[PDB]
Amino acid sequence: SAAQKFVKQVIREAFLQDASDIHIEPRQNDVQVRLRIDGALRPYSTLPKGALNAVISVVKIMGGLNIAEKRLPQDGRVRYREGAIDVDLRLSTLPTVYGEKAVMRLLKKASDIPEIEDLGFAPGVFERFKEVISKPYGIFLITGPTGSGKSFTTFSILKRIATPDKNTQTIEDPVEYEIPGINQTQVNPQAGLTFARALRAFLRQDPDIIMVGEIRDSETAKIATEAALTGHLVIATLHTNDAAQAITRLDEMGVEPFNISAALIGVLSQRLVRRVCEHCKVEVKPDPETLRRLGLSEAEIQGARLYKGMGCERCGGTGYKGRYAIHELLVVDDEIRHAIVAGKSATEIKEIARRKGMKTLREDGLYKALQGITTLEEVLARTI
Amino acid sequence: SAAQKFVKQVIREAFLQDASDIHIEPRQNDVQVRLRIDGALRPYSTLPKGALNAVISVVKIMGGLNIAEKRLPQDGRVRYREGAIDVDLRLSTLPTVYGEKAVMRLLKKASDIPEIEDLGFAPGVFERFKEVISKPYGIFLITGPTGSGKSFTTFSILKRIATPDKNTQTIEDPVEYEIPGINQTQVNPQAGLTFARALRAFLRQDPDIIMVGEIRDSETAKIATEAALTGHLVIATLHTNDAAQAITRLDEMGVEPFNISAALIGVLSQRLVRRVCEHCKVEVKPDPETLRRLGLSEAEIQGARLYKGMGCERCGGTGYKGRYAIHELLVVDDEIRHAIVAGKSATEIKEIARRKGMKTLREDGLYKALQGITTLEEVLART
Amino acid sequence: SAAQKFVKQVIREAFLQDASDIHIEPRQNDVQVRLRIDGALRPYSTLPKGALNAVISVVKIMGGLNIAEKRLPQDGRVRYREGAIDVDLRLSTLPTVYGEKAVMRLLKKASDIPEIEDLGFAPGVFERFKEVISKPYGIFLITGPTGSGKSFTTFSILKRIATPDKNTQTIEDPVEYEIPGINQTQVNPQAGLTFARALRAFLRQDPDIIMVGEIRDSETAKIATEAALTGHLVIATLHTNDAAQAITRLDEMGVEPFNISAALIGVLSQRLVRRVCEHCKVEVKPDPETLRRLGLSEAEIQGARLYKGMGCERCGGTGYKGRYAIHELLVVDDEIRHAIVAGKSATEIKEIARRKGMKTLREDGLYKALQGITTLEEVLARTI
Amino acid sequence: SAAQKFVKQVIREAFLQDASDIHIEPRQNDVQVRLRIDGALRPYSTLPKGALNAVISVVKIMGGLNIAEKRLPQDGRVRYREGAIDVDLRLSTLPTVYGEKAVMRLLKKASDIPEIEDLGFAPGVFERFKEVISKPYGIFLITGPTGSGKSFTTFSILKRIATPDKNTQTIEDPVEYEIPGINQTQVNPQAGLTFARALRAFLRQDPDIIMVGEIRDSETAKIATEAALTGHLVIATLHTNDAAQAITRLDEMGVEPFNISAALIGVLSQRLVRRVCEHCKVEVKPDPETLRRLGLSEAEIQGARLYKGMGCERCGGTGYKGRYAIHELLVVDDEIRHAIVAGKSATEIKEIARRKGMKTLREDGLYKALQGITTLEEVLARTI
What we know:
The structure is cut from a larger assembly and holds 4 copies of chain A.
Chain A: H1 4-16, E1 19-26, E2 30-37, E3 40-48, H2 51-62, E4 74-82, E5 85-96, E6 99-107, H3 123-133, E7 139-142, H4 150-154, H5 156-161, E8 168-172, E9 182-186, H6 195-204, E10 209-212, H7 218-229, E11 233-237, H8 243-252, H9 257-263, E12 264-269, E13 272-276, E14 281-284, H10 288-294, H11 299-302, E15 306-309, E16 320-325, E17 328-331, H12 334-341, H13 346-354, H14 363-369, H15 376-382
Parallel strand pairs in A: 7-11, 7-12, 8-9, 8-10, 10-11
Antiparallel strand pairs in A: 1-2, 1-6, 2-3, 4-5, 5-6, 12-17, 13-16, 14-15
Protein name (chains A, C, D): Type IV pilus assembly ATPase PilB
Subcellular location (chains A, C, D): Cytoplasm
Subunit structure (chains A, C, D): Homohexamer. Interacts with PilC.
């Protein structure tokens, strides 16, 4: 049985205890159970070793995975609730040396959407954000966490452009982000309504603006891109953490390249870094070669200086004052179009867009790192 | 067919007697079934060559392997259970011209892992070790050959930091030691599940702590950097000639060196030397040129002594009881963050580190030899 | 039967006269039977075409193949013996327009394996090879085109460590050098047991030694080397004419140069220049042009007791008796490991290597010939 | 279906006349059965158009093709070696205004094997031919016409290297190009023994020398090349007309470029361009732009005149004095091996050899044109 009582109580308590995730953890004689309370995976409970495989089936059922299988890694998405307990969860299981692990990340439950300007965009990208959002066509991707970051911010563009004067529609399995002005297609793969098939249908639904809640597979990426091809703004949750990465990804997904070429217009990021404790910030020399190699706009290479917190009344034993959303706007002009199709790297696409002082997850990130807002280290982790 | 117990027992004994693995090894007429105790493949039992196949058929039974496919090796973690074992076995069966063969690596458990100091560090070298693993986030690199003790460190550090407050996950193609506080897994890069793909799995699985058994592709350093600095803490392992070289190599491997310039907290390099058995140690004098090259004074050279692991039953006939490593430790600061991004050579980085008080891998080796812990011959033979 | 005797007698003499193999094949009027005595297929006897099928049926019986299926290709193995003869035979057959062809190569046993110091070494080569066998872990890059002595070399290095107390695991197809106490594997790519799959198992066999008769492909190269990197000894076959080129190939076969700079012990580039038969040893000073092609110095020319392989009888008229592993030894020292980690080419490695004493195949083979071992015609055909 | 009566009157005459082809022509009321002889047709027999269709099925039958499908084109070939009938028939059908043309192309009698020097290669080619065979391993690939190029010349290579002391075998269907000292295989695709299968034995038998009469399977291309990887001298026929083409084609066959690149040591070609009278020569401009576009040595681009006959009692009647053997040797070095993987063009891969004085068909040809023996037009006719 339990097994199941751990999934259920770990979930209830994960939410009730202010955790960021749920774990039932395959172990040597047992299965450890942990909750990410205040960011830390504190012990919760224990199951006997085989109970582990029981808990991975439970979570697979919840989000469209192969329930029966007890040996292979899988992931999908769960909308879970129980009374006071109500969270969008990231579903994933993983075979371990003691059977598969059962994990449910707690994603921000819908929580609506932030705007682009709300991010506090550096003028390097903000003035250009206005440029890009004024152009309601092509694929316009968003980076970061499931729900939480990406699907949370994916519709950020839409909040700026899905105005009374534009047709917006989104495909989700099931719908979480009930956002204006969007038609939120509810994906039901068991009947053939995959995001992919729904996207082809989005064209049938005459989009000005097209959305994907999560581009989770090749048929979906292929079709999302087809959906952009006829001149519509395919805004989408791209399973990435870097704007330039979001751009190249369609090739990686096996998207038929004729669609890729006709589709991409730009990418939005706000990926978070640990924010340096500004008030006890430790001078750290950035390495300007680190910054150069990163491809930053010279002043932001040379006059740049790092900090790290030493620990503080404003960061605790982390060295960082909570978090900082790093800004980015990539813009796909004709030369970038060629770069995408050619399979150019995130560094190359970002480095190009970055010039003229344009902020990227790397340039804004590192730029702020270099003021003492974050640490170049963290930024680099954001933009690897 | 006594073979069923036979398989389970060679396995049982390999684990019981502290082997790293099990070998049901064929011969022209019989089978040399062995246990790798202290590194020696001790003869558990022979089998008639005909019984070889009965025995290998059994390892395929126990492992759920395609027992009918005599033309192929088959492999996986086998839940063999008898006496000493609840060790999982990396069963690998294989056809031979004598019939078939099978090997079972002992997937030691959490409870079997060594400490981070047990690795054999000099106090100041260890101080650096400790500082690096003690951070709440960031990455600790380990480097050297399998048999470098890299495993001891790899498993040990997580034993040390994989507490009940940090979900830990580990990426180990051979598994070897199934760490505490951890949801450790298999890799098999042939399947697409490379060591980097496994890091991505860990992140999907919300680890607070992530570890890489082998950096192969650049993603095993780059994702490791991500996790290390996306709020998680990371341990990761390479195969180099020094600590300094870990940095050199990651740049060379395609880790755009602003990665690691970023997460790298520090680097450990090591090599195991066989550890002289107390029932084998023989006093011999080490060579003055080597000793001098490794920093020993003339007065010390004349008083210098090595101990040779001559051989006894208490050490599996290897002459050495257990293993001990040669060490080098680097802590990352601004001098190093530059060197990392700059793509500096192992020599260039090592010299910076020596300025900072780091003993080199080879110098430290000598000093272990001089205590009779190992033999200088063994040190040199291992670096 | 005559067929049994045709097979018995050719094998009988194949062993006794030192053939590396037996070749029975149809020609336009008969079937020629040849022995690779001292490196070339001297004529042994012939048999009358219908006899091909009778004789070949017998060799198929020996190797376990389908007796007379002269319409489709096959392979297998036999444990052959007569007394004083004991050799396994390598069997494969080919349907031809004249009936079906076969080859029975002689599968040399452990008793036929040289020592390490015998692997083409000059006094200075062993001193340096001492340093090679003394390296902590890694791979021995034995290299050259088919027809060379690579299988002896792989076994010589292996034999040193090929014991009942070591996990000696070899790839042969079928097994030749049976050493009781070690595991010797026949690959089966038809089943899926490619050399690489076998090696994957070998790595999974927790080998002390991965000895590979043929680096068939990239995975085969890597996996054997993965053991080399992961604390084991690896002994294997490459196809180059420079030791520097062997390394270049190891790097170019997909074996990571960064890992190779750790995993590589040494390179044994060698070619079996055929040795001039003692009974045909006619002083020749080759063309004379080959004398200059191989680089002889005046001193070496004056001492050039170069002989022509006229054959006479010792290998029939094929020219030579005994073979010599011309040996270009590259000790993979820290400067070579550096050249490797740096991604250096065969030229660049060769320049460092020769600077460090890596006498080339051209120079060494040449010297062997000067010493009365071989003919420079063979050295030229055995170098680059 | 007789139909066949008219066709058979023709296979009799067509084979007797050394015709290039047998033409069952889909005409308006009837079917012509024509003979292409000495480069051009003459008619011989006539079927009704109803019989056209009968023959379309007949030739599809001979190749094991879909004989019911009288509307769509199909091909293959058959061993028509019935005494007086001694030429393979190339099976092809092709739909026209009155049904498919049914074709029985005469895959010209081997005309056996030249002793390669016999080709009359320019000295900078022949002496290099000799240089290539001095290193007897890997692939020595040859192109050119059936009966005057394909296996004609690859077997010429065997004739010059595959002595009785080498384990040498070929794959043909049927065997025609015969060499004493060598095994020659009949492929039996009917049994399932395709050229790939024939090669599987060639690889498995560990020969000194391997010959493929026609690289006619994915697996054939692959296996021949896999054998070459280990140093077997895989001489092979690639049924095309240019060495430069032959250098990269196996990749098209699905053959791993690792094995293709590692394998090659040289590739030849030959042509029959028509000669001119010389005595009654017509000056034709050796246009240097033609020659430059061709990539010829300046020795030929500028150092030249072409000569055409007048058609002309010393030619004829096309203005040319019979067939003129033109040759090529693309010697393969390390840079060429890099080019194989790259997939360099025929002009480029050919140009490299040409600039070394190694006259290619394009140079040896055009050279012979530019020397006034033939015209650039006839050579270009073949050096396309």
